[PDB]
Amino acid sequence: SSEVDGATLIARSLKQQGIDHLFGVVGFPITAIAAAAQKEGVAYLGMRNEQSAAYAAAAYGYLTGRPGAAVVVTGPGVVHGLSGLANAQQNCWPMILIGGASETYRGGMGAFQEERQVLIASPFCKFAHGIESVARIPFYVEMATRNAIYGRPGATYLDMPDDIIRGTCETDKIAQAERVPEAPRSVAPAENVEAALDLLEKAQRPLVLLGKGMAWSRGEDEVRAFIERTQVPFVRSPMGKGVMPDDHPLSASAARTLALQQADVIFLMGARLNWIFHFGLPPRYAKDVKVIQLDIAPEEIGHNKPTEVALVGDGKAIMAQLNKALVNRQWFHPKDTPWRQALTKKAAENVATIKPQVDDDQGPAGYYRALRDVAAWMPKNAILSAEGAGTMDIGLTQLASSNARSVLNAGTYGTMGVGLGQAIAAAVSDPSRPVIHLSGDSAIGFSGMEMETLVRYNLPVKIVVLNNGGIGPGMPEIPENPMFNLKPNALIYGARYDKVMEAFGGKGIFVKEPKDIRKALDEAMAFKGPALVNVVLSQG
């Protein structure tokens, strides 16, 4: 019975919206929400820090198409949780942060962990609101959900006072709500679709720029049909990896700088001309390059660089339009244009310049030598998580993707500390696929304690640490008087993160010699549980 409590109703509302997992760290006043989630069919993962819980929620949202959810305690719980709200806002990922709030009737008294939580969360959110009654919990979870996954996805925050979590409400008084339907689709006008193909027809050096917005739209099939039909070369953002297969002959990634610099028409597909693509401006682009832009957010059209043809709407639906329109066209990009020859030639020279490093078996291993074994060992159906600077940037050029939404990295915000949260999100989003987490030694220190979480929930994430002893290469040894003589970027060289995984009950392997890398990787993969292979890296 006849009555529902606040904790039960918010958990029930998460399930109603199709949210199957909940990340958090319990304590006053939200422990009952986690308990209620488990009884309402929502799996709960108790993390070691709200940072990881909120970052996992954000990535889980991207992977599932419904909002990710995290639940955090009053005060410092929300402050820690802001990390995830910012990351979801920046990446255009859907999430709900549920923040506990102190008793409503203690306002102004200095209650335990009293904080202006809607105020401090609002800058990161599409929608942020306090829940004033049990009866309207379903309304607020529905509204948060809609604002998270409609349009440009983003972050949302809900404040749940302690006396609301513990309050109760008759069933006939609960607000009516419904599962938020899959987002409505908008498509381009016919003339815009034709104008896009017209511009491509005239291009001497066309280039497609693939971003994770197309992965979020789940239009990889439409994109693949388009690229195959038009035979236009493509480049890709790090998490746009896999929308097209990296090992496709039309990939210009190995000649990326030349491609952007010389293209006369770029086709943005769910990608922004922000820092990742160097703003679409010289010296990285031709000053007169013309832009075809496909984005769901109207305000992004013409950002930084004017757009010639705007395709505002859903990536999958609009790419379907272009494929249908290509039936009535003879045009395709010839296989032997100077454009294709130039990109092929430069790609080969760049790969040749790097080959000596790939084949260098001298120890300690460099990035390219270590990643040679990782690349050969990657399962084709793996979800790849990557975090770091050199380890991440080189790792994602050397590890090819074949499926979309199968790369998770530092993202638009360049955040360190998302690593194991995003790995854990990948692992619970699809337990049938292996999850590889490639990390630098600095990155793993932000969230390393989540290794305990990996063992606790039997999540067999395979971690590979490339260890050069710092944020970038460190020093050969720790000097005396380190507070003044140790480089700010330096960490213990060869710090035994493998022994940390062992400590909690996983498989840790320490590798100093390149010849032993692949054996460690195979052993880590065979272990039925989480593993960490700690590879000593050259500092040169």
Ligand X SMILES: Nc1ncnc2c1ncn2[C@@H]1O[C@H](COP(=O)(O)OP(=O)(O)O)[C@@H](O)[C@H]1O
Ligand Y SMILES: Cc1ncc(Cn2c(C)c(CCOP(=O)(O)OP(=O)(O)O)sc2=O)c(N)n1
State in angstroms the smallest separation of the CB of 510 from Mg ion: 16
The stretch among 54-62, 153-161, 223-231, 411-419 that binds ligand Y (CB under 6 A) is: 411-419
In the shown chain, the binding pattern of residues 449 to 468 toward Mg ion, with x for contact by CB under 5 A and - for none, equals -------------------x
CA distance 264 to 92: 28
**Applying CB under 8 A, does 79 fall inside the site for a copy of itself?**
yes
| H or E segment and range at residue 531 | strand 531-536
- For a copy of itself, the binding residue among 312, 420, 424, 435 (CB under 8 A) is 312
Burial readout 72-81 (b: 16 or more C-beta within 10 A, e: otherwise): bbbbebbbbb
- Contact between 314 and ligand X (CB under 6 A)? yes
Report the amino acid identity of residue 77: G
Q: Please check if 314 is assigned to a binding site.
A: yes
User: Cα-atom radius of gyration of the chain, to the nearest Å?
Assistant: 25
**Does 253 help bind ligand X (rule: CB under 6 A)?**
no
Q: Which stretch binds a copy of itself (CB under 8 A): 174-182, 210-218, 232-240, 245-253?
A: 174-182
Which residues, 6 or more positions from 7, have their beta carbon under 8 angstroms from its beta carbon?
30, 32, 33, 35, 36, 165, 166
Q: Which does 414 bind (CB under 5 to 8 A by kind): ligand X, ligand Y, Mg ion, none?
A: ligand Y
| Binding residue (CB under 6 A) for ligand Y from 41, 76, 123, 479 | 76
Distance CA 149, CA 103 (A): 31
Q: Which of 80, 126, 136, 212 binds ligand X (CB under 6 A)?
A: 212
Using rule CB under 6 A, residue 388 touches ligand Y: yes
Are 510 and 439 spatial neighbours (Cβ–Cβ below 8 Å)?
A: no
Among 211, 233, 440, 448, binds ligand X (CB under 6 A): 211
- DSSP letter at 305 equals S
Pull the structure tokens for residue 237: 């953002």
- Among positions 423-482, residues that touch a copy of itself (CB under 8 A) are 428, 442, 445-446, 448-449, 452, 455-458, 471, 478, 482
Neighbour-count burial for 292-301, b at 16+ CB within 10 Å, e otherwise:
bbbbbeeebb
Q: Give the total residue count for the chain.
A: 540
The DSSP symbol for 172 reads G
| Residues paired with residue 160 on neighbouring β-strands, in sequence order | 100
Letters for 421-460 (x = contact with ligand Y by CB under 6 A, - = none) are -------------------xxxx-----------------
Please check if 152 is assigned to a binding site. yes
Residue 179 contacts residue 204 (beta carbons within 8 Å) = no
Whether residue 393 is annotated as binding a ligand: the answer is no
Residue partners of 249: CB distance under 8 A and separation at least 6: none
Report the site for a copy of itself in 115-154 (rule: CB under 8 A): 115-116, 118-120, 122-124, 126-127, 129-130, 132-133, 135-136, 139-140, 143, 146-147, 150-151
Position among 441, 450, 452, 498 found at the interface with Mg ion (CB under 5 A): 441
Q: Which residue, chain included where needed, has tokens 């006053």?
A: 28
Nearer to ligand Y, 401 or 467 (CB): 467
For the annotated binding site for ADP, the residues are 152, 212, 237, 272, 295, 314-315
Binding residues: 152, 212, 237, 272, 295, 314-315, 441, 468, 470
